[PDB]
Every structure is written in structure tokens, then in C-alpha cells.
Assembly symmetry: D2
């Protein structure tokens, strides 16, 4: 038995070489993750073909060793920003991967703000499954949060200082049902920098615009209050925020506010998780229990080269539902610098404390098969990128975000 | 000796089959026109490769016999709206061809307003020649005259009644110097229909916006005055107008106002050519002499099936320069219904009256080689589409606009 | 749920347009046959991708309406000579399809005897599954039965009169286990015509060569005796014969002798089935019972246009095993001219007489889904091509050979 | 002005990535050589497109740094064995490049003797120019000198010890007239090793077979006599010989015998050049004058690393005409180990002694533009590979054979 990625790399014809290389790098990772999760073979085939047609052509050039060909500058390494494997208790794991759609010539004068890649990707996703990509929220939030090509090109003197000119990021939720639902992120840093406004008063103003235009109830009050305070900006890198929404029926879609932060103690972490105490209840408590566990399990150890932790880098997503007024957080703990060995051990011990034997097995399976550099290289710091904790009435919701192109950093 | 189109169709690899079919149909036409003009062989190769990479992928599906696959509705037949061969006295002929960039899925829910094709085409043209496609005017006139995908998708109830939802048209001026300069048309029918404004007060308001933003002097006063009158709207189909501009340095670029018209006598034709008398001088006179000659030479004859001329369909371009206040007209006489034999004979007799022996030879050469249905079928009404008369201090400027996909209508 | 053929035609990139058209035509047929048989979804994907990579590029040009582009002349219409669905009692149905591998330029001076297509196909099949295509028998029978390109090109004056210059035919047995085992046919008509020998004394001499070179026991004596008689040549078209062998381990492979025939009564049919009585036993009897049933069930009816049966066209395969001395026949009844309605009704009544309810359901399913012209057009004579009867100790073995490109003949 | 290789790499679509990489590596070299020679632009385009369609797909995988993917073993580095630029006095320079056509899977069980690549290449060359590739001599010498796939696969125990299993090598003579005439080499090492015969008695026996079959007079007597002696085998590596012939009209084609040799003094060199004195006249004298000049100009110097010359490696081609009995030699001096600086200086001083100013300029132009490692790296030993001296009644005929993939060895 050949596995779908091998057989497909053998038979498939690729428009470009960089697509072939991105395939050789990721398709193993994605396919092994999907197969260890428990996907059916035809779903592996469908999602790998989606990746081959829709995604890979909208990843950008492949990094040669000196990364000379990569003209679309970014602080993150090229490729999918992450590939995620969800872990709940009772509900089945799901594979995801978010990608900043980069065009083949983005960063160059021909496509200096990469306007088409995300739209080409949305188009391919809609064509491979008609009626699966609803652009009702995309089309409302695009003029408010995102900058078209023309604006960014005539408002260039205003943004040419920005390093990462990202304006939209697509997160595809590859489902066990072969349905690849999309999820678009809009970082308004470009738009705010052009209009000289703030991320808060633009993100949330657009959210309220969509509220009144739809009648859907997206209560952003808690989040605006918190993110508008002083001691939050004290640590918050508000310029690394973005608004996320599911490209679905706005009634059944969700909106999420995201921001980064460099905290030093669990009190600031609870500040972000809780929105300054404005969010409480049993779920906040039971969630921060696990956040604290993983905090003092991961950030309690040595970094490579014997360096010291200046601070703890975190990220946070607050999800607001359409029919409710609830806001639910999701805290990222960044481990780009940690030992993949230490991160994996922490994840495993957490899962065991939760009683998740099946999930530790799945985790180590994906680890050894898709990410061989954790077992081969005892000082690897490339596979794991973030770990995300969220708590729902179902129970915990942990989410290990790995780098699929970790084979490129080794 | 194989000629470039044959050899290229033999060696070239095409992404899609429709590209191969469009090649088989057009590349003969374009290459024969370029070769009869007097292009060099390498320029033929360069322009045919431009067509193969930039253009053909942004033409749309190829019409099967029932035209079942063509989802992007249009009153014109699919393919390039026209392929033009210029004819002056002293300056060398030039090949052109304007195309409404259609995506492979335009008209379908995945790309219901065809937003990407023109941008993809502009991108390819800029990448094949960096710094040859200046988007200074494109980026200013895009929000004013053209509708992005999102707007058109949420403002759909306002435009879903329109048959031709064209919003941008690219005219590539393939030059003897291998340089393929672009030229973008913006028909604001979508934008005006959404904003419930008029083509006049939107086109010219955008022109004045660009004036004040640039300092370049585009005197639109004559054209606004005329096109705002009553007896002009009496005949004018103002909903078939568009603003044209060369995607170049705005200093060296030109802006052109276009409108259609169904006139019955040469007095209305002089109304449009002259802007109600506001334009005069030796050039207007010497130009309308030739317009009258060709009028009573072409519209003086029988239509196929023995039908009668309800009226004479014309189009008109008024060009406004950046450094001057001059406006120069260019009158189209539509011959979509006439006998290609009669149209060719009229063109030939005109050229002979002008003393253009070389040009009648070139014309008949292109006719017999690229358009064999004029000699084979004595009742052909498909090759020729329009003839355009303009008069400059150089002399006359006649321009025969043929349909390259005339092989598809036979 | 999109079915594999639709989704694959949506995502897959095709080297050539003719591959896209062959896909649109066959992949529905093949996929519907495989799905009605009961194949798993991933096996459908694997086999359709095999068809897309290995087979389709080695089918030849796609027939336009006038079939102008088809330079490789053949009495059969272009495309797969047949697509077969096996029907046994107890063992699961299997899909097959034999194709004369035609190159993209076969019949033209560049590839006037189509030498590469079959080898390219064998190569692709071996690369998509290493060690699945054993060329031990192919490499022994190639010089004996088949003509290389050079020989056929210098021995051209000797064969240029032949209409069908076929020299090798590949029958792929797409298995429910995703394994696509090959099966090569060698019609020695070219070789015999060059060497001025007879099909009998070349086919069987090569078989004996392989016997002595291998030690495997392929008893051809019965078949040589019969096919060398006089009254068999009376009806036999010995020039339509070929030697078949499974490209596998010669120990586990089988060899088959094939010949056509135009008989008029069941006595000549029993002559061919029995090898002039030399083959007998319970199986021959029980097999000719069914041959007679289907004979007087199909050839007992009207042809289109009210024409009369000059004679009954049949074909016959005698399989010889490696470890045994048994020879087992397989009689084809050609129905290219009959009513697809009559043929389907006969097949259904036969299956019912055998008690094969599941198989009549599968048959009508494949009929209505893959071959809609049998239900739409009540006078269709294109879907069905042959029906093949063989009898093994398992029971009967009927095999309905349909034309997949029947959509092209309607 | 973009030059053809840049523009073509920008617009062209490549089936495979390795084709793109081979393009990036060679097309600069080939195009710069053709442009420095003085080719027209359209001829550059034609030949680069020939390379893109016919050749590049039949070069094999592209060498990654560890050359892990290269399964077709060879003592030479992958890519074109050489790219040649001819230099005469009076006749215009010509570009050539010989390539061992390697399939994408050659060396692996799927194509273990690489039988198709050369045939695919011949087919493409014949299709891009019908009637330009005459296979009259190819089809006669193929069974005699070359081993089909089947023979080599069943006669594997006899050849599996050979390192380089080359059996046919195509040398394309890209002409200023855009005509790419082919030239096929047959090294009978495989055939001789299978039939346990000698290269002499097989090559020359096949030549005599073609003589009697054609009536063309290819007098091989001198060459058979010499190559059959004892003191020639003393130095000759007869296992590195091959028979060459132009794939043209056998009347106008030429046959050439090739052999390698490791000589130590100019007396053995004159032995090979002269066929043991059997060849004489003014031309032999005037040719060996130049051979001696270049011998003591190149082999008179230091090797890298301060190593010593065990012996001088040479190669020799004796051309036999169809209508005459003349045999004309062509002596290769191998400089794979020498300093590209020393080799270039020797070539330049030779040309100057001949009065070839234009040619030294062309040579240094090709050097600095196509082979930058001779000027950048003062210890480069990769660009130049061989230098070939032949003398015709026109005058000298020197031929500098460079490695185009020298960019891969740096």
C-alpha cells in the first residue's frame, strides 16, 4: 500500500516546481496528521488534492537555502503559519492549517501587497465545492479592515515601513467529512496605518457595522473595554491583532478577536484570558487551571544555548457568537524557542493528567512520523510553534500548532 | 520555415485545453496581422508568448458549438472584442487587440463579477516586463469607476438585472518594439447603477479628482457639456460608455471618453464627432470629410437577408491630453451586420482615395490569410466589426477592427 | 458528495486537452462501473489517477466530429477497445479495460508504427507500482511476435498495405485491491507479414521457445492442431489473432490464444469452443449450453434498418496454464450491430436464468448511469460491443464488454 | 530588452520542475553561445524552445547537491555531455551539444536501460520539423549496435556489471538556419558484452552491412586494420568506442568511428591521428602541427593540487564519407582536469597564431558571459572539458567543448 501522499506525488502533474517541493514537504505532514487522526482514505485524497490545487499554488516560492527567492517579507518562515491538530474529550480530532496566501510574485513591483492570492484561494475553494464558501462577512469586512491593491499602492508612503504587510490570512479547517471550510483573518494594521486610526476602534467599529447591517448579535463590549485600557497596552502588542470570521452563513459563523502579548506572570495572563475580570464563571476558572499547569510546565525550563526568558510570549482569541452574547477565550502559549522535546513532554503529561491516552498515542504518532527531527535531533526547536488552550462546556480544548515546513529548517 | 504560431503551438505546453483552442483560433490571426504589418520574427514570438501566458488564460472558456460552457454572459461573442490594425500615412502600422479579461469561472457563484481576471492579466503583463505597467491611474480610477468583488456581491440586488456586467477591459497595444503596453477601460455602468448616479457625473467627477490629485490638465468641460445635453441623450446610449486611460506615466498617458450612439443622418454624426460644434478647426473638417465618405460608402448598401437599416450604429472616443486642453475625436462605424466583402471594398476604395497602395496590399493580405471566410464565403458578415476614423495633424488615422474568433462563427 | 471523477476533473491539471476530453468521456464510465461493482472510494481515486497518468496520455488524440485529427488508422473507433465488467457466481465482479496504446503522433511520419506508447504505458504502470509489472514474458515475446520501430520502418513496403498496424495491446485489470495488473496482447500480423510466415507457426513457435527457456508447461498442441486444420480456416480470420499473456511472474501468469471467426451455425461455434472436439468434459458442455442460450437469444432478432445477418461474428480465447496442461476457452459474441436494448435484455434474462439478481441490478445500474443512450435512444447500437462466455469449475463466467466512448458516437 | 532565455523562462510553462532547473542552468549557456556566435533572435527562440520541448524532458533528473536522485549512473556528471562551439576560418561558427537522453526513471527497475528517452527525443525532433530526422541509418544500425529494452533486460546477468549502460547518444547540431539536425552515437559496449564479440568486428561488420544494403561506399578498411592491431590496444580503451552517423539522407550523411586513448607521447597521438601511418597527405601534416602545438601548450603545465600527469587522455573521430573513400580524423584533447584559465589561454594563443581575432573575442565573450567561474574562481576546472582539432581543405577546424552544467559543479 502506497499512502495517498506518495501515490499522488507520483501521478500528479504540478503547474510549477515550487508546488512540487511544497508538496514533498507538507503533504507528508498533512497526510500523516490526517491519517493518525483517523481520517478515511478518500478524505485524505480529497484534502491533499485541495491542497494541491487551491492551497499550494497560493503559498509562494519555495525557500532555497539562502531564501533568496522569497520577496514577500515576513517575520515567520515561509509556508503555512501552522498546521493544527485539535484534541478534545469526546469529540473527534480535526486537522487545520492556516496559510497567509502569497502570490508567486508578491513583494515585487508586480504584486507589492499580494492582493490576489487570498482571492484566488477563496475562488478555488468555492469552485471545488460550490456553496461552501459564503462571502457575506468577507465582503462586509473587506473594505473596513483590508486594503485593496490600489489603496495600498497609492497609500504606499504610509505603509512601506511595515515589515509584514499581511492583510488577509486563510485558515482551512479540513474536516473528516471531506468538507474544507474556510476561515479568513483580517489584520487591519495596513488599514489602521493608512487611516491613522487604532486597531480597536476599527475592528470593533466594523463589527458593529456588521451587527446593525445583519441584526446578528456580536457583543464586542467586553473586548473593546479591555483592549482599550492602559495596563493592557502596557504588555499588549496591539499591532499584531486581527479579526477572524468563518466564511459561512453569518448566522452560524463566529467572529474572533486576536491579539498578541508579552507577559511575565500568570496575573497578566489571567488579565488577557479574563478581559480584566469581565469574563468569569466555571469555564474561565477550569480553563486557567490548565493554562497555569502548562505555563509552569513549559516556561519552567531551559532554552537552547542556555538563554533566559526575557518574558513569555502569548496570544489570545476571544470568540463571540452570533445568537449569544458569550465571549470565549483561547490562549496561545508560544513555544517557537522551546525544546520540541520539552514541549512534547509537557503536552503528553497534560494529556495524561486529563486521562487522554488515545490522544497521547496520536500525538507521539504524528510526532515520530511527520516530525522526525524531534526524535533524531535531541535539540530541535522547530516542529512545535504554539499550544492553545480553550475550555468549553464539553471540557478542555487543547490544540497543538506545529510547523509543517520544519523539514526546511533542518 | 514554420511560422511562429505553428512552431509555438507545436512546442508550447498549455495549462488548459481552452488555451490551446484559443491559440489555434487567434494565434494564426494575430501572427498573420503582425507579420503582414512588418513585424520582426522575434517580436512575433514575444507577442505570441505574451498572448499565450498573459492573455489566453484570461479569455475564458472556449465556445463549444452550443456555447453551453460560457457562463459569463455578454452581447458580444466570446473572445477578444476586437483585433485592430492601425493605418496612418508615414507612421508604421501597429497591431492591437482589446479583451474583456474573463476568468475561467466568471459568471458562476465562484466568480460572479469576474474581479480577478483583469488584475491577473495586469500582474502578468507587469511581470513579463517590470516597470512597463504603471498603475498610477488604474489605482485612482478603480474605486471611483469600477466595482470590487465584495461591493458587487453585496450590491447584487442592484445589478443582477444587467446582462453584461463588464467592469474593466484591457486593450493591449502590441508594438513593433516587442513592448506590450496596456490600456484599461472602465465602464461605470455597475458603479453608477449601484450608486444610482449618472455616467457623466461619475466619469467626469473621477477625471476631475485625478486632475486635482495630479495637477495634470484633462479638460473634460466640452465633453461633459455635450454629453449632458438633451438631444444627445436623444440618440446616445449613455449606458454603453466607458472611461479609457493608458496604464503608463500619467504625464505621458491619455484619457478617453467613449459612448455609443444610434444615429440616422450625418448631422447627428457630426454632433457626436464635434461635441455639438464645441470642437472645430481644420482637423474636425478633414476628419468628417472621411467619415462622410465611409458613411455613404458602407451604409449605402444591402444587408444580408434583404433587411433594412433601422439606424446607423456608431461609437466615439474623445481623447484628452495631459499637457494640453485639446480633445480629439475618433468615430467608430459599426459593420457587424454588413458584408465583409462590402466593408473590405469600402476600406480599399478609401485607402486608394488616400493614395495608400501599401496599405491596401497589407489589408488584402491580412484579409485572405487570416480571414479566409471573406474570399470563401461570399456572404460573410463576421470578420469585420468596426472601422474607426480619426484625424491628427499627421493626417488621417483609420483603424480596421476585425473579429479574430471569426473562425468560430463559421 | 462529489464523486471521484467530478472532483478529480475539477482539481486535476492535465498535460493536454485531449486528456481532459478523454477524461470527461471515460472517467464517468470507469468510475460508475467501479462504483456499481462495489469498489471503495480510495480505489476509485487510485484507478482514476492511474487512468489520468498512465493510460489517458497513451490513448491518442480525441476524435473531433469528422475524426480529422486521428492519424492512427483503425477499424475500431478511437478510445479503449472495450471496458469490461466481469460477472461470476461467488467471486466479486472486477473492472477491466483494454486499450491499444496510441501515441500522440502515431500514424504520422514521426511515429508511423506507434512503438513507444505501449512501452511508455508499461513504464508508467511500473513506476506507479514498482515490482507490479514483470516483463519476463514481454521481453521474450517482443522480438518473436512484435515488430520494433526500426524493423517496421525498413520493412515498410511489406506492411504499408495493412490498415490496422497494431502490434501490442494492453489490458489493465483494475482490481478492488487498487492493484492495476497489466496484460499485453501481441498480434503478430505485422511480424508474420514481414517474415512471410503464418500466425500459427509463429505464435506457437514463440510459445514453445518460452516453454523450453522457462521450463513452464504451456501445452499449445490442441490449439495448434485445431488452428492448423482446413475447415477452421474455412471460417477463421486467422489474421485477426493475437497471443496474450499476463505481465506477471511467468509461473503465475497465463497465456491465451485469440482468433476471430465468422460462423453461421452453432456447429462451427462448438468447433471453435472445443478445438474440433479435442476439448471436452463437463465444463465444455455446461459452457456451450450458455453459449447456445445467448446465441439464440441475441442473434435471433432484428438488426437496425431491417438488415439481415450475413453471418455471426465471434471471437475465442483459449487459456493455457503454466503448471497444468489444461486449455480453457472463452467465446466472444460480437454485438456491435445489435440493439443495446436487445443485448441488455438478453444479458438480463441470462443472469435471471442463472439466479443472478444482484448482477442484473448492477448491470442495469451501470447501464442507466454510465450508458444513458440505451434508455434515451431506443435504437442505440453503441454501448455494448461484445459478450464473453467462459465456464470454470466455479461456474459460469460472463463478461459484458462495453464501449466507454459510446458518448462520442451519439 | 530581455534576452530570449530570460523572457522564455518567465512565460514558459514547464511540465516538471527538473525541466525548469535544467533551463535555468543551460538556457543561459546555450543562448549566450548562440548569441555570441551571431545567431538571429528568432533562431535563439526556436532552438531554446526545441531544448525546452525535445531535449530538457530527456535529460533526466536535476542533481541535488548530494546527487541522490540520479539513478542513471554515469562517470560523467549529469546533463549534456558537452556543448560545443565550432571555430573555422571563413565558415561561420556553429553551436552543438550532445546529450545522452536519460528518461525520468532511467536506472530504476521501471526503465533499467533507458530505452525510450532517445526514441522520444528523435520523435519530438521529427515532429517539430517533419522530414528533418531521417531514420534510414538509425533503423539499420539499431539492431546491430544497440540493445533494445527486452534484450538488455533478459541479458541482464551479462551487463549488470557495467557502470555506464549507455547505448545511444544524440548530438543536436543547432544551426543558424533554425534547423536542428540530429546525430546519433551507438556505443556497442552493451551489444558486444552480450554477444561476447569485439567492438571492432561488430561496428565495422554493421558498417559493411549498411554498405552492401545501401551501395554507399564507407571504406572502413584503414580503421579496422589500425584498431585491430596490438600496439593500439596497448593504449586504446576500445570499450569507450562508438559509431556515429548523421540522421539524414544516408547519401549526404557521414559515419564516424570513435575511440578513447591514454597516450604519453606525441608518437602515440600520431598513431591514432594517422591510423598507424595509413592516413597521410598535406592535411594530416598540417593537422598534427596544430595538435602538437596545443599538446605542448596545454599538457605542459600544472594541474590543481600540484598533481602529476600519469598520461594524456585523448579521443579521436575518423569520419568516412558516403561518396568518397577518404577518412578524416578529429582528435580530442581532454582537459577536464586542467585549469580553465590555462585551457582558455591556450585556445586564445592558438587562435591568435591562426590570426583569428574575431574568434578570440567570441571565445572570451562566451567565457565571461556563460562561464563566469573562469573569471571569478582563479582555480576553476569545470567549464572546459575537451578541445578537438581537425583539419580540412578549408583549413583548421578547432572545437571547444564546454560543460554547460558547470554552474552545478560550483
Amino acid at each position: 500500500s502506497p499512502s495517498p501522499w506518495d501515490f499522488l506525488g507520483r501521478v500528479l502533474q504540478f503547474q510549477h516546481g515550487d508546488h512540487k517541493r511544497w508538496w514533498d514537504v507538507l503533504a507528508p505532514v498533512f497526510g500523516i496528521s490526517m491519517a493518525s487522526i483517523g481520517y478515511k482514505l478518500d478524505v485524505q485524497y480529497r484534502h491533499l488534492l485541495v491542497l494541491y490545487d487551491a492551497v499550494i499554488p497560493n503559498m509562494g516560492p519555495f525557500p532555497n537555502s539562502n531564501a533568496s527567492n522569497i520577496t514577500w517579507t515576513s517575520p515567520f518562515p515561509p509556508g503555512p503559519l501552522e498546521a493544527s491538530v485539535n484534541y478534545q474529550a469526546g469529540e473527534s480530532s480535526m486537522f487545520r492549517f492556516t496559510i497567509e496566501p502569497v502570490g508567486p510574485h508578491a513583494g515585487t513591483p508586480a504584486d507589492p501587497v499580494n492582493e490576489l492570492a487570498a482571492k484566488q484561494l477563496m475562488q478555488r475553494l468555492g469552485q471545488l465545492q460550490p456553496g461552501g464558501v459564503d462571502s457575506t462577512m468577507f465582503d462586509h469586512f473587506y473594505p473596513l479592515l483590508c486594503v485593496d491593491g490600489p489603496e495600498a499602492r497609492r497609500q504606499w508612503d504610509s505603509i512601506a515601513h511595515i515589515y509584514h504587510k499581511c492583510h488577509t490570512v486563510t485558515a482551512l479547517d479540513m474536516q473528516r467529512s471531506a468538507a474544507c471550510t474556510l476561515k479568513t483573518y483580517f489584520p487591519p494594521l495596513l488599514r489602521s496605518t493608512i487611516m491613522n486610526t487604532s486597531m480597536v476602534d476599527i475592528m470593533f467599529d466594523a463589527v458593529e457595522s456588521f451587527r446593525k447591517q445583519s441584526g446578528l448579535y456580536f457583543d464586542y463590549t467586553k473586548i473593546k473595554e479591555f483592549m482599550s485600557e492602559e495596563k493592557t497596552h502596557e504588555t499588549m502588542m496591539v499591532d499584531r491583532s486581527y479579526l477572524s470570521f468563518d466564511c459561512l452563513d453569518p448566522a452560524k459563523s463566529r467572529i474572533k478577536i486576536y491579539t498578541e502579548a508579552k507577559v511575565k506572570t500568570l496575573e497578566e495572563a489571567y488579565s488577557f484570558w479574563s478581559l480584566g475580570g469581565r469574563l468569569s464563571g466555571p469555564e474561565i476558572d477550569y480553563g486557567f487551571k490548565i493554562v497555569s499547569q502548562m505555563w509552569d510546565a513549559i516556561y519552567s525550563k531551559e532554552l537552547p544555548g542556555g538563554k533566559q526568558r526575557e518574558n513569555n510570549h502569548i496570544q489570545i482569541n476571544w470568540e463571540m457568537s452570533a445568537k449569544d452574547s458569550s465571549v470565549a477565550p483561547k490562549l496561545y502559549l508560544t513555544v517557537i524557542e522551546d525544546y520540541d522535546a520539552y514541549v512534547s513532554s509537557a503536552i503528553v503529561d497534560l494529556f495524561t493528567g486529563l486521562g487522554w491516552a488515545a490522544h497521547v498515542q496520536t500525538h507521539k504518532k504524528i510526532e515520530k512520523e511527520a516530525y522526525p527531527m524531534c526524535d533524531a535531533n535531541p535539540q530541535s526547536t522547530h516542529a512545535y510553534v504554539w499550544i492553545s488552550l480553550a475550555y468549553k462546556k464539553t471540557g478542555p480544548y487543547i490544540t497543538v500548532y506545529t510547523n509543517p515546513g520544519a523539514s526546511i529548517l533542518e
